[model samples]
Structure formats: structure tokens, C-alpha cells
Target: LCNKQQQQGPFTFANYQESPLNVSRLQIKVTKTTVQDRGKNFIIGYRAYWRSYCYNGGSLDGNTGCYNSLNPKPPTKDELKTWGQEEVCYTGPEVQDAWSGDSSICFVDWKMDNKHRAKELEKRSNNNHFAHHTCNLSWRCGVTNTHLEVRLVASGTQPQAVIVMPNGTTRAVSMVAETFWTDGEFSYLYSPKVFGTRAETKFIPCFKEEKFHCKDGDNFFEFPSSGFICLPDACYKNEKQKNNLLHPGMWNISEKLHAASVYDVNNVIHSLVYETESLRLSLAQLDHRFSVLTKLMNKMVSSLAKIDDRLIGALLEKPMASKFISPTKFMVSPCSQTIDLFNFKTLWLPQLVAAKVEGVVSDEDGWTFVANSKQALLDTMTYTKNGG
Candidate 1:
């Protein structure tokens, strides 16, 4: 108490802090995106957002203050240039195509607020924003990549085919959609989304991942596969009547032995019955050929063992018998065999004792399977013939 003031009345006051704890400026800047070499190519434009704050309590040139948490407005060009290490940058690419790329940033600029501007900011403290405006930005073509070549077939959908130049240098990316398939003189065409209008149709090249893979100029086989796809609009009548379903319309299609979204009119019925005429014939062929093949290779290989090494020595003309100077062992094919093939339908009483009894079968109730066989290799030694 140092000589307290007395005004015959009660009074109270609050002291001021050194500075107000309010945000003054906000900034959102995007660094330009650079792609394959180009002159100062900011493939992605100068785009960002920000807001500025105000100061109080004293008069000062205001640009710096406490930072705030909100979307920021871009800084002034003078401020940006003046500030070292602060340059124009964009976030990323902004794509808006169906079955296409990503969405990214844009190039934009904001106006500057006055120094020591307060009431506007004070009012802004109550969630008051500046103002809304409209604008357009189209002058960035100067910074655009001059070497931008849309090499028609640039699909990254499938296994990419990468090819390098003769010298160790840049690569030519052969997209999958344009390769690996060929038909007649006329090949299939793929239209990409970047071809401006989906209506102008995409400039889809053949699926060509490599030089020899899917070139449109080549045919699939000896005979040139040749056909054309004509997509003429035939839905004028149906859609006009507000029919969204796929209408039964006709257009030129590729000459395929076969040809989706067939849900509007079809379902595939696969039979699990496992008995069809074609399948039955196939089974018969397998039954006839499979067993024959199983035994034929074994017999063919066994013939090699019958060939005598001494006979090989005598083949060439040596008046007297020429012994093998140095006996050499040569590898021949192996011999694998199986046994006992018989058929049974209605078993008659054994007439000639030629049927099999339980030998290897091990199960209960005197049950033994003859067909369900385990592939156990039986060792065999085939010796020479006594042919004269």
C-alpha cells in the first residue's frame, strides 16, 4: 500500500499483458512439382491458401504475429520473393477422370491485408472470415512441359513391359494393353482417358508391351487376323423412353468364336453332372491312350538294355573283331512297369482261375479295392535276349 487513491467510491481495474494471444497470419504454400526434364517446369502449378492476422497494444509494421490453426491464404509476391528459401510450390496433380489419376493441388494467389489492421481481425476472432471472390488461372502454360508427348498407349494396368535403348539410356515403356494379343490384319484398339473427350473416343493403341508383343501391324498367326470394330450409337430409341437397361441392339463385333454385363439377360448354367457326350468321348480316348502310353515308353526304353556293347564295337569295318579300347558307359532311358489289367462286370464263377485274389489290399470286412492303387514302384531287372 503506497498512498492508495481515495475517490469516496469503490473502483477496480485489470492490468494488461505484454501482448494479445491472438493469431496474426496464416499461410498455405505448395511447392511446385517437377517431372522429367523441362525448363523450370512446374508441372504442378503455384497453388496454396492462407490468412493474415492483426496486431494491437502498439503501433508496429505488422506481418509477423502468433500463428493460428486454420487454412491459410497465400502470401504476397513481394513477401514471397523477399523471403529467401520461400518459393512457389504446388501440392500435386489434380485428376478428375473416371478410371484415372489422382486429385491434387492448383496454382493460385491471395491479396494482402494492411499492417496493424485490428478490428477486422478482432471481428475475425469471432470466426469472421475476410471475403469471398471468384477467379481463373490459365497463364501457367509457359511453365508447362514442352516435351509432353502423349504416346497414345500409356496404360499401367497390367504387367508393364520395359525396353531399354541399345545404349544404356532412357527406356521405352510398352504398356500392357497394347501388346500380347494379335488377331487378323486388323488388331484390337484401346482408347485411353486422356484423349480429351471420351466421346471423341480414346486413342487406344493395340496392347503392345514390347516391340514384338502386341504390334497392331502384325497378325496372330500365318493367316492375317483382320477385323474392325464399329461402335455406332444404336440406343437412341430405348434411352429416349427412359429405359436404362441394355437394349437388344446390333453393331459390328470382332470375329471371335466367342464374346459381359450380361446380367440384364443371361446366366451361365454349368452342369456338375459330369456326363456329357463330348466328355464321355474324351474319357474313352483317355482310357484307351493313357494305359497304352503307360506301358509303351517302358518297353521302348527296355530295348536299349538289350543292345550289346560288343555289338556297337563290331558295327564299323574291322576285319578282325575290334575290342572296345576303353569301355564307356552310356546312359539310356529307364524302365518302369506296372501289372495285371483285368475287367469285371457280372462275375461268373471262376472258370480258368485268372482273376485276382486279395494280395495287397488291407481293409476290414474282407473288403479290398482293385482300382484305388498306390503308385509303388516295383523293381525289375531286364536281361538280354537269346535270339539267334
Candidate 2:
């Protein structure tokens, strides 16, 4: 049992009962079963939720036109065809001819009986939201060329669409999507931050190096090696499926590098590092520890180089010995001799320093002096002044 931060009360008895000298700590044991598996497979599933909103048309008919279409006015068998009643409905102009007047066209309102449409729209919206939020954050930090995706689930009609800002203030738009008989499974793709006097549209921006489109008119997009953009309904159709939506022709990085690229690259590098580290520990064991260390060092160097090549080069040129000796005029135990300096540097300095030490210095036959020096180097590297 965990020891909670609580005090025991003082006991009292009219019969003058003696209290125990010491209170034994409370102990509780809990048993749980866990399963481990390495199997891989894909399957389809359904979800349920609601998204609600008020329909106020010029104040006259405030709640007249399907406040929540999922719960329509008690439909009869004969009304099914005319009402097209369902949990969610799409209310848009239904005129066949382009020249038809807007008033002449009847707005078709029906629950999205087709799961595919619901999923597709949900996926697109979710993805777009993700991209938008990422871009917003990147711009706030003065970064460019960012991309992102977001996914969401709702029980009822979504009352507000998330809005991201460069300054980090989000204003929710007062628009809600209906969820008539919808499974509440939805997703969408968000793009870079865009601003104007008009409502935003889902057209891919030209500023980005790459653009994605569905092969079979399905709502799927991707930035290969980065992420896959799957609209809810789009993933259901095999004909529209494209494995690698991001092609070289679509994304040519020869032009201006945006902050979004930095975000994406950093994310990729971090994921790689995590995976490599896990593999080294689990598969290769301790024998490959050095390899893991080296890999991490290389990744760090590469990341830094992408941002500033000069900084990395200058770092490599600096002597590891000096870096160790520069701090702490005196060396302590575990660093008994000057030879221990090398060990100290290898152990205590950052991964880059360890990498340089391993590359430039030799320890053939495993000399004791070299080992001790490395120890001293590590000790000095971790040394910190006491409040000075």
C-alpha cells in the first residue's frame, strides 16, 4: 500500500485502555494480469457520439429547421423517403442546374446514412485542424514550413471548431456539425496558418513544398516519411488508397526552408532515436551500447548541422582535454591522476564530446592510464560550483 500524507488521531477511552507503543504500517497488495503480443493487423470499427448546436435563421424561426436532425419530428414509414431522416444531415443547396436561383433550390437535410461520407469529412477536418495548430505554434516561435494533423471524436454535434493562433489564443468558431445517427468517428487534416477577410477553404497552399491528393477521389493525403493523412471515409476504399502520397515531384526542398520543415525533421529524428535506443537495448543488448551511443551522437550532430553547420564544426575542432580542465582548478577522488582526465571527459561531457573522444583517441590493449584519464575527464565534466 502507498503511504498517504495523513495523520493518525489521538485515542481516548473512559476505561483507560492502554494504547499500543507503535502503530504498524498498513500494507495492501494488488494483483493484475497483463498480456504481451507482437501481432500486427488492421480492422474496421464504429463509434457513437453527439454534436449539437442551435439553428437561428434571422431570429424568426430560431428552432424550426432541424436543431438536431438525428432526432427528427417522429418520422412515419411514408415520411422516410421525403424526410430522409437520420442522426446527421447535410443542409446544402440541391439544385441540379448551375443557373438555378438560390431560393429555387431546396436545402437537402438528411442524416448521413452513408458511413463513408461521415468518416471522410471527419478525417479531413481533424487532419486540417492538426496542421493548423502546428503551423500556429511554429509561427508563434518564429518558425516556418511546418505541417500537422489532428483527429477527434464526438458524441453529439461539435459545437465549435478549434481555432489556433500565432500568439496562442484560440477563438472557437460558433459553427456546429450535425451528428444524426452518426457513429461519432471523425478526422481531418489542418494546414499552415492562413488569415484573411473571407472564410478559409481546404485548398492546399502553394507555400508548402509538397501537396497530397487521393488517387481515386478519396479523402487521403500524406507527407511521406512524415505522416499519413487519412480522411475517415477515405481509408475504406481500396481503389483510392495510395501508400506514398508525398513524392519528390510534389515536395522540392531546394527552395526556402520553412520552420515547419524544422519541426517535421526534429520529430523524425526524435522518433528514430527512440526506436534505435529501444532496439539496441532489447535486441543487441549491452554489447551494442557503444553503437547506440555513437548513433545518438551522430543524430545530434546532424540535427545541429542542419540548423548551424559552423557551430557543429567549431565544436568538433575544440579539444576535449581543455574542456575538461577548463573548469575546477582542482580534481577530486575517482579522478586521482591527470591520466584520469580522458575518462572524465568521455563520461561526463555531452554525447558529442564522447563521440569525439572515441574517434580521436585510441585505447588499444585498454591502457590503464587512458582509462583513468577518461574517468577524470568525465568527473570534471559533471563538476558544478556550490552556489558560486
Candidate 3:
């Protein structure tokens, strides 16, 4: 039994809930599993959905042409059963060609029936309006100097082309159905050229109106590491795809450096201040500790001088004694008792004999003092006005 409106075309009121205007989904099923293995081929059939603009309304057309009727009817059960087709596809032999004999063409559209020439004229006239299965091999169809080998697979929920790289890793490109109301054919089908080498192919400009001659060293590749554009070269010419391309070369490098230099510089300086604040406090603590140590050393010096005075007194045999004569005067008693006035230039001695005496006299240069009116043991002293 047919699923109620399975054969209905897109943009129609009957199955508007199932197919929307922007939904161009392709469903594929592969019978042969070993298509990816070397020297093997497989046939695949798909239910490709597409969007179409009609004179009145529209419905999803699974066949070769878009409907233009005001009220488009869905295909009958018998017609649905009769619509049977498959694609002739193959995978690795890495050297053999993957498509038709032509080496320049990477993508090709197919029909359900054998009327190839007639369909070609109709498809080109309508700018490939129908949602037929498409077969696109490598950037150049036949083998070349590239280590890349491409194979189309109907794996997962959707069908996609896998790129077998020089390394064992693989990259996939999803194949979506073409919509006539859109700008161009589905550009995802274009395979990448020889990548990861110096002999890389040039990309076709997104817009044919403007002459987009890329300057020297303008990298255009499908992968991120090699090129600016993430999509395959000569693939989508849409503005959205063009704008979303990645720029990894010198142009983007300077932009990142400029952003860091302008915006992040302040944050870096702020973090440095935060990080070294402990060291700044440590330096202040070191200076404070040094002042404390210096004060401790000054106290030690005074204590050492007092110890030296005791040591010198121990060295001498005589008992030393000091007396405070007045507030600003001091007197020291030695082994012999004698009065000596160093500034007056005089000396006095006390002897056991009774005849010891000092005479008193006053003159311009000298002075004398008598003890017993005799000068037996006299002493004279002279003083100048300047205390010389």
C-alpha cells in the first residue's frame, strides 16, 4: 500500500505538512556493502525530495520534472511501483576512473529511464529543476596525481561522498537534493581537487558576474588546515557559504594578535600585580627586620665596652677607684697620694720631716704658698690669663 501522500510533489496544499518549501532532503539505500573496498562497484536507489515554485501551488515530485498544474495530483500506486531506478557506482581501485570517461567533470545528474538525450535537454532548460539522483566523483573525474579517492555511500540517515585521504582517515560531504527555486544546483556535490600538495587546483569564484581573481597565496581548500573556505572549491556560490569559510592564514593571525595586544593587555598587567603582591609585602617585611637587627647590634656594642673596662682593671695590680668631685669633675686615687694640678703647673708633697714647708708669693709670672713660714719644701706655680 502507498503511504497516503508518498508520491506527492512539494509546495502543494495536500501534503504541506510533510514537505516544506526549504526542505530538500535526499533519502538513499545501498544494496552492496563492499563498495568501499578496493575494486568493487554497487548500485543505489534513492528518494530525493526537492522544492519547486509552480504557477499555482506545488507538491513534492519524486520523478524527473517539476509540476506546473494548479491542482497537482499525487502519483498512483501503480505509478509508484513502476518508478524504479538505480545508480551505477564504484569505489577504490585507486587508479581507475570513478565516473564517465570524461576526466574534467566531477558531478553528473541522472534520470530513472534510458531517455538520456531527451532528459538532458529538458533538465538544462529548466536549470536542473528535477530532484534526480546525482553522481559526482572527484574534482577531476579520472585519476591524477592526487592521493585522494572518493566514493559515494548511502550510509546513516543521508547519503554522502567519502574522501579517502592519503592517510587512513576519511572525510565526508553530505549530498542534498537540488531545489529549482533556489539560486543554483546543490553545490555540495563538487569534490575537492588535489589537496595537501603544491599542485593544488584553483577554486571557481562564487559569483560569475564579478571577476574574482585571487591574489598570490590566497588559499582556497575544503579542509580547515589547508584553505580558508571549508566547502569544496567550485562548489557553493551562495553568500552564506562564502561568508562562513574559515580564514587561517596571515590575515587572520594579525587580527588575533591585534585583539590580544589591545584588549587583553590590561588584564595581563592586572594579573601580574595580583600575582606579585605577596613579594612586595615580603620586601617591606625584610626592611623592617633589618632595622630591628641594627638596633640589637648597637645595644651589643655598649655591652661589649663595659666588659672591656672590667678586663683592663683585672690586668693592673693596683686597686682602682673613681670619685665624683662635682657634677662635671672627677677624681682618681692611685698607689701614691699626691695633688697635682696639671693646668696650674704645680705639685704638692707631704713628707715625714717637720721641715717641709711651702712659701706664699704673688708675682707677674709666678705664685707660691708657704706652709710654715719657711721654704724647705716649697713649690711654685705660674698661670697665664689664657690658662695655658
Candidate 4:
């Protein structure tokens, strides 16, 4: 029941012949049953347009998917949209006897959610291509951490998804079969924007941090939180499943998954944004400092550049024939010993060298980076040591 733009004829309810004297001024539902909030064998919803009930839903009325008698009722499924392998019922397949009414809602905020999908009947026409049933509500929900589980069901031609979250807040996930969760195999499938600039994955880089064996502090699994959905693989790497492999990880997950540890991916990813500037750490600055200091350390160990310009000369002075050393004989005193040829000079007392480190990653400092990255997040402000 949708056109790219506002359309003709069934235009206004103010003036019409077979029905209301005006078109855009009337509203009605397709049900003979007296139900307010139910769509099954009851009233789905009502909106009007003179002779046209511009919007209607519910099969309880058992109206035809193909009805256009205003006896000029709504358009047929074929009339709603152009043909594909089948026709598109812009509102829905069950949304019959309605003129352009498919911008949102399958049944206009009624008892029909993607989960409570309607049954589809086999109705086909010659120019209409083939035959199939269809219902897809443009619903969307997301989860990044292992804490949330999302699932979808393909009722007719469209897949209806159920996203299970930890907050005890659960809802329907739609528009996925055509929008987010398009390509997939195994029963029902989903995926995330793991490789994008979008950071839903910021908390969901790896299935688990351990999945990737990165260097001690490597930043790998830094992507969004989404299950694997596929083709429409036509958009991404565009590598559809090929070769000998039949089951792909993108669309397949082990059914054994029953209990997941509790961790709020949403809170970890976004909660910090609401905090005051005084309470937040400037990660950009810290990240920049590490980048700079790390480069400096590398140059100090292998290259000639050094961070500290402070001198590092030996403490003990060399013994001269005219000042402190007896050139002819080995010294009987430890301080009188001459330096070995391997390394010049000699130490006076505690042969010490000044420390050359900046911003050391102590237990305190390291926690500042990703204390919240794990199942447990502990931010200890200050600590004490036993005085020895």
C-alpha cells in the first residue's frame, strides 16, 4: 500500500462517488470482529481515504490481499509494489484491502509484531512473477557483548528476529532480513559491523578476548557487537560462501551456547560519554603519549635517539699519576682499582645509573586502560603497601 510519493485517484474522502463524499476523511479496518488490540480474526487497525481504507490489517476479516472494489477498496499485493520473485505488499502480505499504507508498521502499532507474524497463503499471478507469502516489519535492535543474544524467525518471506538482552529488556528485531541481517545460512543468522569505523564492536572485537592470541598489549578485537550475517555479502568483502565449505561461522553458532557471563556491552561502550570532563580520563592524550613514549623507548634500545638528555658519567674519577692513582702498581684499595678495558672508568660506591623511564605501566596505570573490558571491572583509586 505504498508509492514512492503521494498518489492519485483514491485521493480524498471529501468528494467521491461510490463511497464517502470525501476521500482523505474516512478510516476503517478489514475486520468484521469487534476487537480493539488484536489482529488475529479481529480488527487490526484503521486509517482512511474516502473510498479507500488507505490502511488496514488483520486476516480475521479474511479480506483479499487483492481487493480493489470501492467497491474501490485497497490495491492487491501486486498493486502495492513492483514484482520480484514475488510481489511486495508494501504494508505486509496480510495487509489487504488498503490503499498506500506501508511507510512503517505492519499493522499500525497493533497486536502484530514481527514475532506474532501472520500466516501467508500461496497467491500468484502471471505478471506477478511467482508465488510466496511475505511479512517484514522494519524493527531494529542491537547487542555487542556476549551478554545479549539475538535471534530471528522467518515466518513467511521475511525473517522476524528476537533479541535477548541481560537488562530483562527484550523486543523484536526487524528490517534485518532485508536491512541488517540479510545473508545467512544455519536456521536463523545475524552479524555485526565488525570491520567498520562504527564501534558497536568496540566492546565485541573477539568472541572472547582469548579467541585472538595477540601480543601482550596488542589492540586487535576492536570492532562492533553483531552476529555474523551474510550476502548481501554483495556489500562487504563480497566473498559469498565458495569452495568446499558449507557451514560458515558468519551465519552459524554452536547451539551449545546456554549461559553467557553478565557484562553490559552498552554501558562499557557508551556510559562514559555522559560523565563530567573532570571525572573522565582523556584517552586520546594517554594514547598519544604511549605512542610517543613507545617510539622513544624503541630508539633508546636499538637506535641512537634518547629521551633523557641528563648526563650519565661515572661517579668514581680516574686516578691520575699527578692526582689520585699509582700507575706502577695494582691498587690495594677497592676505590684505588683501575677500570677494566671492557668498560672504561670505575665506580666509587654504589655504581648507580639514573632511571630512564616515563609513564611506567604499573598495576595502577594499566588498570586505567581497560579495567572495564572484562567480566569484572575494578577501578581502585589508591592503594597501600606494607611499610617494610
Candidate 5:
């Protein structure tokens, strides 16, 4: 039997006992060393061998299968080469209107009226019509061609259509009105607002001969006679008096009419003038407001409903999935056998070593000691004795 010096522990002979004791005895005799020395030497040899094996295994050509300087090599370049060119042929002579020739294409070029420009022109024309109607009454009424001049002035585009009145002021009037006259009778006649007088009517006596002047030379009736036929003065008085209650100051009993109160007469003639203008403007603003709200609501609703499940799942599962799957694997699977056991070992071994080094004491086992580290445990006699 061999006797060995024990460290500070309650180690019995049974702990040191081994199978094939005769072979171990022969080795001890040949080496001429104690069991303690033999155990120490064995541990030292095991550590050296394991360390060397691990170092070599981590090399490029080593059993670890890692890439390093020892296995350095460039990728092979493919030597095969290929070349080809595509060709297309057309068999026809080019004609002027043929599909194959440049001349076959004819682009139409024409001037189109700009919508904003057209709208501006229409607005100006309408404003001119309103101005003409506010200045004259009987001439603005349908019986006389004096109102016809107003429409012409509002619609005429020619620069020369502007007429110089007896008051020596120029305002636009229709030159087209001259073309409709059988004689040169009303050719140069200006509308009531433009001329400011009816004296030019005597130069063209068709006014007096045809009795076309309203109120027959009265100061308030100083409008063109030949351009517009006027009703008798009695008819004007009767109509004006009939709607007098529907006129201005009808709402306010104290407000009296004046010479400049023609605005009230114009408003009375075209009822709802102010109300209709406001209504049109309000409708335009309403259309614009609805368009903006509709677009914003649609964009917000679409973003809220967009598909995002895949993006959320990718973020949530990436780390856990990477642990169970190889970087080269195409699909993630729960049953993947290529799980990183080495990483798990590296993580758990250090924790176990710390726990052991702290020394766990149990009441059932008296004064139990632990290995201080993985190296300490690996170098222990128990590890070698157990063939680990």
C-alpha cells in the first residue's frame, strides 16, 4: 500500500482508491515517487496536454475548424469568358406619315386660353356692366338701345372702342354698335355715363324726330336719345311711385331720398344683389376647406392602418432567434441542433467556479470545501482520478 500526504481535508483512503491498482503500483516503483508526487505530476501533465490541444485546435488548420493565418488563401477566379451582342433589323422605307420615321410624328401647337386669365377677364367685364347700370336708369332699361351700348362697352376688347364724350372724357364703348346702324345716325353716339350730356342728340335729330329721349330734355333725363328709346315721363313717375314703399328708408321712416341716393334705386331694381354676392364667396371658401380636411384625414387613417406586424416581430424575436440559429441558416427553427453550447458553457462555467470558490457549507456534510476556480478543479486529484 502507498501512503500520501493529504491537504487540509477529511480525505479517506477510499477517496484515493483506484481500479488497476497493480499497474499503478508498478508505475510508482519504476518512477520511485510517492502517490502525492505522482498525482501532482499527472495533473501538471494533463493541464499541459489540454492547453496545447486547445491552442492548436483554435488555429486555422486545427481541429477547431476556425479560419486564421495558417489557412490563408485567396478565392479562385473563374477563367471562362463570354461575349454576345444583340441586333435588330427593320425592312421598310421611311415615309412622311409612317410609324418608323421621325416625320411621321406631327405635334399640334395651338394657343389655349389660360383659365386664370379668362376668369380675370370675365370678372372685369361683369364689374363694367354693374358700373354702367348704376349710372343710368331708363337707358339701362330694355326699351332703349342706350343700355345696348353699355353691354357693348363691357364686352369690347378693341383699344379704339373707347369713345370721347361731349364732356371731353374718354370711356370704352362698343365700336360694334356703328355697324348695326342703317344710316350714320347713332354711329358716334356715346352711352349716358360716358357723355354726361344729351346735347350730342341734336346733331343726330333722330332723337327728337323719333322721340327717343326720356322726359324730353329734362335735366334728370340727359341720356342718349337715338341709342335707347325712352317711355313717356308719366310711365316713369307711376312705376317709381308704385315701388316707393319697397325703396330705401322704407325700413327707417326718417331717412329721406337725395339726388345721390341712386344707389338705393339700383339695389331696389336688382333684389338680393348684396346677399347673392356673399353667398357665392362663402360657397367658394367652403369648397376649399372641405378639400383640405378630406386630404389630411385620409393620410392619417392610412398610416394608422398600415401593415407593421412583421417589423414588430423582427424586433421582439431577433436576439432569442440568433441564439438557437446558425448565422448561415436560411430559416429559423425551434428544433435547431446547431445551438451554441460552447457559448453557454463559457457563460455557466465562470458562474459555477465563483459559487464553488465561495465554499458552500451544509449541515448534513461537515466542513465541506469547494474548488476556488475552474483551473483549481481541473488540477484537483479528483478530476484526474475520474478520468476527466
Candidate 6:
């Protein structure tokens, strides 16, 4: 059936079976019907407008000839754009189990459309990949969850204090050489590797004039230990040398107290050691003071209990008076022989033994107790022994 209508599916042969019933058809027809009373009958006819059939092995294109499986048609640009990518897959069996005419076993034959083109596109893209080259120091690259092996080739050796020589030997950097070379001050005078031909000496202008003092300037306290002498011009020069280390300078001579003083070096050292005799005596005096402090602390510890009792009114000669005193109840300082008490009326026991009485009774029969003040108190209470 040849028509202008589009179709689908390129049916396969050889492997086709009746289990799936590979047969389908589509048809479009126009019918005409007429009726006449005089003729008692009318006419009915139909015309085929369009038709399509998918035979067991025939394609949907109206080609009735059955054929073996064939590859699908190449996809158009519009179809590929709709699906995001183009993929032409093989739908036929890869290997034939049995041969037909000739006695030969069929091998696996897989087909993929545009596979070579895909690999070539990948090759072109690989050259511009972000992780194609090694990473720099502290830099990261690559993608996905896995680490980039190319980053492992990065090196941080150039920035370190140790350097690798051309001969594969490593040498530690010398700060002295670096300082002089970087400062461009005395680099011509000192070198660890390169040497000059002729023997020559050039004295520093400041050193020749003996202007090598740091007084009233930046006092370099610990600089002398760094193998350098601080000149007055603020230039700290290197003192390390191949021969005749620490050459004579005026600073060394100025360190002498007196050039003509008659005193052996050991004599001066002995006098310095003897000078510590007063310090030894001073240490003994300090030990005596430590002993006195220990005795004083012992006295303070003994008085500490009294301090606690005083804080609690146990050291008072007179009881602290309160307006809300409990009936017939009293508080007495045990340290004092006399105790003055307050009530709605003020009274106390002047002369009495230190006693701890628990229970008390108020005999209304008439009685007055008087407490006299001691040297430590300013008030007293007088009461008769008998009821008054």
C-alpha cells in the first residue's frame, strides 16, 4: 500500500515467530451510500483512502518483501535534538548459533552507529580537559568523587629552605649568604661555592675608622651570637671566615677595664667569687627571717580560734542586747567571767563561775541580778541575790 502517510517500525525476519503474532494493519476508507424510491434500491460503494500493513517480516513502509534484520535508519538532527543524544543500537542477535550453506560457525558481530565518530569527539575533548595537566601547589583539580592523580605530581620543593643541586645533592640554605646577597652589601666578600682568583682585602670604611658601636642606636642585644658585628652605620656584617676568624677590632679592645691595671685573670675571678661572701651572709639572714615568720604564723594560728569566737560574740564580755530576746533565755561569752544580759529590763550576772545552764525558770517571787562591767566592757548590771 503506497500512501503519503508516515509509518513506524522496521519489522525483522528469520527470528520472527508466531508466538507474538507479528501481524498488524491500518486502513482508511471512504464509503458512499444512496437510496431512490423509484428504483426501490440504491448503491453502496467504498474507496480505499490509505492502507498500511506489518507482515511477519515485512516493514511498515508497505514493502511486502520479507528480509533479514537490518539496521535502523540514521536519526535526523531534529530527532537527535529532541532526545538530547543520538544512539543507534543493534537489535539483532550478535552471534548466529548455526551456519546455513557453508559449514562455518558464526562469530559475534556487534554493530554501533557512529561509534568511531564518538571516540574521535572524545579525543578532541580530552585535550581541553581541566584535569589533563598536573595541579599547582595547594591547588585542586579533577572532578567526581575520586582524587586527581595528576595533582600528585605537583611539587613544593622550590619554596623550601633546602635546595637540590644539579648533581642531585641537597644543601641547606645559609642565612648569612642569603642576607648578604639579598642586601647586596658584602656579597663580594663572602661566598660558600664560588671563589675569586687573586688574593685581596678591602676593609670596611666604618670598621677601618673604628665606628662599630651600637650605643644610642638599635641595641642589638643578642646579635653578636649570630656570627656578625653590628657596625655604627646599622650594617650587621658576617664574621664567619675561612681563616683567622673574629679579627681584631676596637670593640674588643674597648672591653678591657684598664690596660695597665696589675691583676691576673684568675685573681680577678677569685675576687669575684670572694665578693659573694656578703651574699652568703645575706642568705643566712634571710633564713633567720624565714624562721621568725614561721613562729609568727604559729602565733597567728593559735589566735585564729579566738577570731572565730569573736565573730560569733563568744569573746565579748557582755552579751549583745536584742529587743526580741526569748523569755528567760540568755547568751554568754564563755571567755569572760562576767556576762551582762538584756531583757524588757537589762540585767546580768556579774560575779559567777563559767556555767552552761540548759533549762531556766523565772521565779516571779522578786529577784534582781546585777552584772558589773570589766575593763573590756562599758556597761554593767546589778541585781540582788535575794528577791527584791
Report lDDT per candidate. 0.24, 0.27, 0.27, 0.25, 0.22, 0.24
Highest TM-score scorer: 3
Query: What is the TM-score (0 to 1) of candidate 5?
Result: 0.13
Question: Scored by Cα lDDT, where does model 3 land?
Answer: 0.27
> lDDT score, residue 280, model 4?
53
Clashes of each: 29, 61, 14, 35, 4, 6
> Could you give candidate 1's per-residue lDDT for residues 1-388 as a string of tens digits?
5656655556677653654544322121111111112232112112222122222222353422322222323323333222212322322122111110110112222232222211111101111112211111111100011122121111221111122111222233333332211121111122222222122211222322112111111222111122111112111111122222322222322211013335522443234233466688888987988789868754653443245533333333332322332223343322297665764377534223232222111221111110111011011112211111
Q: What is the lDDT of candidate 1?
A: 0.24
Better of 1 and 3 by TM-score: 3
* Candidate 5: tens digits of C-alpha lDDT, residues 199-238: 1112211123222322222212322321331211111112
Candidate 6, 279-364: lDDT as tens digits: 79888987998999888765664455343534334334444422213322334334358665842465433233242321111111
For model 1 the TM-score comes to: 0.17
TM-score of each: 0.17, 0.14, 0.18, 0.17, 0.13, 0.17
How many Å off is the CA of 292 in candidate 6?
2.0
Question: Once model 5 is optimally superposed onto the true structure by TM-score, how far is the C-alpha of residue 335 displaced, in angstroms?
Answer: 34
Give the poorly placed runs of model 2, Cα more than 4 Å off: 1-89, 97-163, 166-169, 172-388
- Please give the RMSD of candidate 1 to the true structure: 44.1
lDDT of 2 at 157: 24
Residue 332 error, candidate 3, Å: 24
lDDT of 4 by residue, 1-388 (tens): 5686865676655642553432121111110111011111101111111111212344443442432111112322222112111212222223322223332322353432222111222221111111222222221111111112234322232223344322333345433331122211101122333211111112211223313211111222111122222211111110222222222123222211223334654564466556645345666666887998877664453322122112111112433212213222222232287866777466544223343222212222112212232211112112211111
Residue 118 of candidate 3: its Cα lDDT?
A: 10
Clashing pairs in 5: 144-228, 144-229, 145-228, 146-227
